Ligand binder design. Structure first.
Ligand SMILES: CCCCCCCCCCCCC/C=C\[C@H](O)[C@H](N)CO
Ligand SMILES: CCCCCCCCCCCCC/C=C\[C@H](O)[C@H](N)CO
Ligand SMILES: *C(=O)CCCCCCCCCCCCC
Ligand SMILES: *C(=O)CCCCCCCCCCCCC
Ligand SMILES: *C(=O)CCCCCCCCCCCCC
Lengths: 5, 235, 283, 268, 60, 235, 60, 151, 32, 60, 60, 5, 5
């Protein structure tokens, strides 16, 4: 889906 | 702008592509469909309809009504063929222009079973037994009942049920055959013989015609769309 | 579940041996290769193996476009005595040698085919006239369909044949085609004939070429310059690149060791000595 | 086995025929696939197949050839080598289509004082090279199909220079495996070696292999059997030793489709 | 508004799918889905008023 | 339109790319696969099969059946080599055309262990002990048993088990070697010697051949695909 | 309809992934996944009827 | 003859990147190559030339190096090639860390050969600091278009 | 619900027959 | 087999059920019931003539 | 498969982010993240065996 | 959002 | 939506 850093 | 990288195929026009494009007449009020009879969903539906074979393409009979008539007579029994035909449904000249043959000439490959139905058009008083044969390829094409008997066949008894059908079952090495004359994908031999002879009483015509029809079975299919040679436009 | 990019097996440490187990002794008559690993015949240390066979999977080995042909076309002045050249090519991977040799490591294959087209043009006469940008038509004419006889005849209508209209100087054209064989796999080798010679038939009538199946296996590509004749003549070339995507192969074969000589396995006299001199006891 | 069973001692029985051997080097099953009948999910011709079972799936022995110091090698094609073998051949020529697997048993005994080694290779689609440098792919059906006598390999390529009446036959050069590839690599094909000090036979069980489920046996050979001397025959100090080589082959799980009148091929 | 459909996978290397988004208001601008139906040929092959039983006489 | 910005690489054709492209034959009826025997999934499977080495490429023996035969005889013991070979599997002329050598010539780099198996083709009555050696690179190549003994080796006793295998273990400075002759990535020396001598009784051939085979071990791999020099097309 | 797979990361600067969407109905139009399987060489390296035990005599 | 180019891949033909990398002994990296292509006329002619396509072929150590602008090697069945169209965006590809060592050596204090006593000096000789003679192979570039009246 | 890309009907195995069922006999006059 | 140990050989033992030309050549004998005998340590070999008859008992 | 990271915002007009999707199977094709780590210089500035206390004599 | 066929 | 391998 989406990774977030 | 979003970083993009143009790939090969960019800006080409492939005539078989399937893309969206802008509508030149936006918000156009389309006329609704009505339920017209006779809708077709697949070209093979048309191939499953019997159409009549131009069996006799002799120099004088071809391109006339006579080409569809196979003449029989009450002559003494012979083991010689009434007709001989190659199972090359798109390319043999007798099959290539039937509705089946015509649809096959828009495709490169065909597969499946076929069927030949013969109609006896003699008088009610005329009787007879005929042998309809299919020989799969690879041996000498049958020129005598003795050989034709050994292959797939139907012995037709003439009577109230006017017509008789022989099914040519899908028997092939390849999964699809070519729609042109090709030895590797050859289909074999269709032929008809006198099993006994046509017999008539007195006061009766001694010669008569049979008509023949070909159509596809429900297991029949075609593929690789192509242009036909059956129409052109020189100049 | 073992994938092409998985690491190969670790070396396990192994020590001295003195037993009736004889890994080193074998018998190749059986037709088998002895499955040995270094720890079978020498002392080994433990090594954690990271290398993989990812680049030698069948897909990766073939995952490259190879040139299979060069088609020549032109567009001359209208006044020429010679006809405008359009090209006709029978589709095959056997007009060039490199992809052919790679596919022929195997007897049979299945794949989807990607064709990419590189198009280049030039002037020929030491003129000073110009030519406006050319559009090319690459038409696939499958076995049975009318092959073009003139650069401008009715067949180029393409109502049913697939065609690519390529614009010069744009990205090279590209299309994909499914596995289109009439068999369950492509045969790289066919030990047979397309006809049985019968006794009751003349020899000419029963004859056919060795190893050839359908005369027109896959049809042809016909290419033309769509632009009308121009005062200054331009000649163009269409290079065709074939890539087998989504590929499966069966029955391995020794690779071609002497020069190709025709579409079959035939060889030419004078090309049969690939190997060079080297002395038995010379490193 | 402690009850005496050995890798070297085998008995094979198919139909009314049995082969025994006391000096085998195990046996090979090509590509690990045992022969099988055509499954419904892979079937193609729809007519009821003929499956002759024991009438055709039995051992047929071909004409014995002779191995000498000048022998360059021999080849046969299947089903061609068996086209005249009892009811197998009949079934083959009466039907358009046919498929078959095979047990190939090559026989060659000698003595503890003889030496030599035969490479016995089963090659799928064993296309061989022709004798011509004027016309490619020109080997005639008759020359491509020797029947049981088979053909031979040569150490020398010699082009047919008769342009008026060409020989139209193969010219299969031995170190090029008769097909333009190096013989030392033929071991990637299913094989065994008859090395006289070790074994007196080779046994290869071949599945039906093809790019189709069934095909014309009369037009097409599926397998080729190639036998080449990897190490030349030698004995004591005789200059001209000879030992025989016999081939016995059994069709397995063969089935046929498309029955009609019999095929009568032009074989000469 | 994305439509996700499956491909009929011919040559192989689960279900493989592909995605479609319509960019225009007019359905005429859409590509062809090729998600088409088949029908029985009967209106052309058997247009007779009395149902045909193929093992029976066509005329009785 | 969606704001986009064309990046470098745009419109190029990289022959090693992996993009989607339009299908020229949409809705084509693909023929299903069947379970053909002999499927290969990775080229290294082929490299693990034993193929025979053309050890004797002398001017008269090369390009003939004789090149595969290493001649031994019952002569008195010597410490001199039966054969000498460089471990350069893609470039030494004796290894480069084996199936292993051939596959290696489509790649720039190789790594892993190899194995040499020798087959004794003399008569049953013939006996003998041989020494098969592998010397890793960096010293004088062994020309005498005395040196070869000091490296990796197998002393082969001839008998019922007809064949013997020496494994050349992966011993290298670099993680991969080049598939060409290169001093920095040199592999060392393969050699065979008489350990005792071939002995035969009377009435027995005094000379015989051994055959040799090479194949890759399960830890063997290749990388960086490239074109081979083993085929060309001048004109 | 997006497919998300991992990259085998060689030189480094978690799992790094990449995304794939098929744009066409025909699987023939798809790129190659390179998500391939390996098999054991046995059908070519050990095609013998009786299983080979490498520490044992090949001939008994 | 029509000029095609052959370049042995290296960062040492120019000086600026070389000096930056040489602040360090060893390195690992993925390499991005971008290609800028420019052309001109040479003779004081008035003839024109149609738009050129260039082929940039990577020939790794061992593969046949082209001897003629049009010989069989340009088929590229296995070597990677870029067909670049003139006047389009500069071409670009990436390559992984492809070294045969665990890192690239910017400095190698050694030889690729040991000189042995039992061997002649010529035979044991090699250049100081040089490892694989053909470290990374070559790029071979050509104009794919046929000969044109104006050069 | 039958789609254009659906497989066509399987061939079912069938044996010998001797009955009053006459599939082969028909009458094309009917228009069928 | 009563030859010496050093002697080797393969023989074919045949049984042809009645009704055709009695086999005078290996080619015919091969087509009937048979055992191919390999000479070796097991000194002897057996061919079984299976009961194949029209009548339920034969005359003596 | 979208990766969402924050920008270090220099000149200003919450956290501003940006999005990244990898389009290729090979990590070598990826852009550089610039999400890098720092380390202490000690292996070069203080490579001595006995830990240095800067207020103390370097030599004792 | 997403339809699925 | 999203498949994940
Ligand atoms: C607008 C351009 C469309 C181009 C369409 C090309 C369709 C024809 C595909 C040809 C497939 C060739 C595959 C290679 C050869 C065969 O493997 C062997 N000779 C065995 O069958
Ligand atoms: C279609 C174009 C493909 C181009 C492929 C180029 C592959 C070769 C990569 C070369 C890597 C060079 C790295 C720099 C040099 C080395 O660091 C030092 N001399 C030490 O090994
Ligand atoms: C349904 O469509 C919701 C999901 C949206 C996915 C991203 C859309 C991609 C760009 C479409 C732009 C609009 C076209 C006019
Ligand atoms: C599954 O695909 C649902 C998610 C959709 C993500 C956005 C799609 C991006 C644009 C695809 C356009 C359609 C291609 C014909
Ligand atoms: C994870 O990636 C799921 C979300 C997908 C968002 C839309 C993807 C935009 C287009 C990517 C195309 C694939 C690149 C090969």
């Amino acid at each position: 889906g989406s990774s977030s850093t | 702008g979003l970083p993009v990288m143009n790939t090969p195929g960019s800006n080409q026009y492939l005539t078989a592509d399937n893309f969206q494009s802008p509508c030149a007449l936006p918000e156009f009020d389309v006329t609704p469909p009505i339920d017209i009879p006779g809708e077709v969903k697949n070209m093979m539906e048309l191939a499953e309809i019997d159409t009549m074979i131009p069996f006799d393409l002799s120099a004088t009979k071809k391109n006339t009504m006579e080409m569809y008539r196979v003449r029989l007579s009450d002559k003494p029994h012979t083991d010689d063929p009434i007709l001989c035909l190659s199972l090359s449904p798109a390319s043999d000249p007798r099959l290539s222009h039937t509705m089946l043959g015509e649809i096959l000439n828009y495709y490169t490959h065909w597969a499946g079973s076929l069927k030949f139905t013969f109609l006896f058009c003699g008088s009610m008083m005329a009787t007879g037994k005929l042998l309809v044969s299919y020989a799969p390829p690879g041996a000498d094409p049958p020129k005598k009942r003795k050989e034709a008997m050994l292959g797939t066949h139907v012995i037709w008894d003439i009577g109230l049920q006017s017509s008789c059908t022989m099914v040519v079952p899908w028997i092939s090495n390849t999964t699809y055959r070519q729609t042109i004359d090709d030895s590797f994908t050859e289909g074999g031999y269709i032929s008809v013989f006198y099993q006994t002879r046509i017999v008539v009483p007195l006061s009766t015509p001694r010669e008569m015609d049979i008509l023949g029809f070909v159509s596809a079975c429900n297991d029949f299919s075609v593929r690789l769309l192509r242009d036909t040679t059956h129409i052109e436009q020189k100049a | 579940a073992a994938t092409s990019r998985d690491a190969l097996p670790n070396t396990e440490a192994s020590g001295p041996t003195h037993s009736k187990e004889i890994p080193a002794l074998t018998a190749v008559e059986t037709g088998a290769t002895n499955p040995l690993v270094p720890s079978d015949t020498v002392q080994t240390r433990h090594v954690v193996q990271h290398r993989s066979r990812s680049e030698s999977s069948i897909e990766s080995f073939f995952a490259r476009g190879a040139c299979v042909t060069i088609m020549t076309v032109d567009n001359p002045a209208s006044t020429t005595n010679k006809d405008k050249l359009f090209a006709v090519w029978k589709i095959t991977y056997k007009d060039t040698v490199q992809l052919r040799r790679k596919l022929e490591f195997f007897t049979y294959s299945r794949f989807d085919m990607e064709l990419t087209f590189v198009v280049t043009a030039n002037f020929t006469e030491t003129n000073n006239g110009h030519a406006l940008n050319q559009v090319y038509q690459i038409m696939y004419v499958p076995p049975g369909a009318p092959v073009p006889e003139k650069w401008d005849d009715y067949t180029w209508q393409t109502s049913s044949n697939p065609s690519i209209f390529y614009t010069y100087g744009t990205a090279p054209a590209r299309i994909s085609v499914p596995y289109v064989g009439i068999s369950n796999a492509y045969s790289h080798f066919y030990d047979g004939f397309s006809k049985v010679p019968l006794k009751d038939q003349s020899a000419a009538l029963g004859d056919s070429l060795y190893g050839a199946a359908s005369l027109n296996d896959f049809g042809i590509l016909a290419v033309r310059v769509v632009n009308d004749h121009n005062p200054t003549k331009v000649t163009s070339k269409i290079r065709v690149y074939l890539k087998p995507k989504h590929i499966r192969v069966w029955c391995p074969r020794p690779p071609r060791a002497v020069a190709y000589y025709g579409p079959g396995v035939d060889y030419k006299d004078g090309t049969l000595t690939p190997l060079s001199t080297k002395d038995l006891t010379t490193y | 086995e402690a009850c005496g069973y050995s890798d070297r001692v085998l008995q094979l029985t198919l139909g009314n025929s049995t082969i025994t051997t006391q000096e085998a080097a195990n046996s090979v099953v090509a590509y690990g696939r045992w022969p099988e009948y055509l499954r419904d999910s892979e079937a193609n011709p729809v007519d009821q197949p003929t499956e002759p079972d024991v009438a055709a799936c039995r051992f047929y022995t071909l004409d014995t050839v002779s191995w000498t110091k000048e022998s360059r090698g021999w080849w046969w094609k299947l089903p061609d080598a068996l086209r005249d073998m009892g009811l197998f051949g009949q079934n083959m020529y009466y039907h358009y289509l046919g498929r078959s697997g095979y047990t190939v048993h090559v026989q060659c005994n000698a003595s503890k004082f003889h030496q030599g080694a035969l490479g016995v290779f089963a090659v799928p689609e064993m296309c061989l090279a022709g004798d011509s440098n004027t016309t490619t792919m020109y080997t005639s059906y008759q020359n491509a199909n020797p029947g049981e006598k088979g053909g031979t390999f040569t150490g020398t390529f010699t082009p047919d220079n008769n342009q008026t009446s060409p020989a139209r036959r193969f010219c299969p050069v031995d170190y090029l495996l008769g097909n333009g590839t190096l013989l030392g690599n033929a071991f990637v094909f299913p094989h065994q070696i008859i090395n006289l000090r070790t074994n007196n036979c080779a046994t290869l069980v071949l599945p039906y292999v093809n790019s189709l489920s069934i095909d014309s046996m009369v037009k097409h050979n599926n397998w080729g059997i190639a036998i080449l001397p990897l190490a030349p025959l030698n004995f004591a100090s005789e200059s001209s030793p000879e030992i025989p080589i016999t081939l016995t082959i059994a069709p397995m799980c063969c089935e046929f489709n498309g029955l009609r009148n019999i095929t009568l091929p032009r074989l000469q | 508004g994305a439509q996700v459909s499956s491909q009929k996978v011919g040559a192989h290397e689960s279900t493989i799918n592909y995605t479609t988004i319509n960019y225009y208001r007019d359905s005429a601008s859409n590509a062809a889905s090729k998600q088409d139906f088949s029908q029985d040929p009967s209106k052309f092959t058997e247009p007779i008023k009395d149902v045909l039983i193929k093992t029976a006489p066509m005329l009785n």
